[PDB]
Design a protein around this ligand. Structure first.
Ligand SMILES: COCCOc1cc(N2[C@@H]3CC[C@H]2CN(c2cc(-c4ccccc4O)nnc2N)C3)ccn1
Ligand SMILES: [Zn+2]
Ligand SMILES: [Zn+2]
Length: 113
């Protein structure tokens, strides 16, 4: 339904647009994965690569049957950032915050059970 798509887009836009107390947009690095030719090491280590552009494409093309499916893909993105990057590094830390930002956005926008 158009309502579900509106909610998914509103949730992902909250995640994308989020800035920390310093005004930095944390999603910046995660919008588009570097190409396989630029960073082959990433694709050698990460089995299911995904970025925010792909998640937007999947919402747009009606590929998520529920908000749970959308969540699964956002969590996979953050997991891959944490798998590839060192614990304590900025990319690693940013992905942890974005998991939390998605959950707050889902609770606020969707107002479920
Ligand atoms: C147009 O911009 C697209 C990205 O541009 C880039 C960015 C590159 N970077 C190198 C180091 C910093 C930045 C982002 N980097 C990473 C990106 C990601 C990543 C990006 C999107 C989605 C999930 C991810 O885990 N994960 N770990 C990284 N270390 C790779 C390397 C080559 N092209
Ligand atoms: Zn690049
Ligand atoms: Zn459509």
């Amino acid at each position: 339904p158009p309502k579900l798509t509106k909610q998914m887009n509103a949730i992902i836009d909250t995640v994308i647009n989020y800035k920390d107390s310093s005004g930095r947009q944390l999603s910046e690095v995660f919008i588009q994965l570097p190409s396989r030719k630029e960073l082959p090491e990433y694709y050698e280590l990460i089995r299911k690569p995904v970025d925010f552009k792909k998640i937007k494409e999947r919402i747009r093309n009606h590929k998520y049957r529920s908000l749970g499916d959308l969540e699964k893909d956002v969590m996979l993105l953050c997991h891959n950032a944490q798998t590839f990057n060192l614990e304590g590094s900025q990319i690693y830390e940013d992905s942890i915050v974005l998991q939390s930002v998605f959950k707050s956005a889902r609770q606020k926008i969707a107002k479920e059970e």
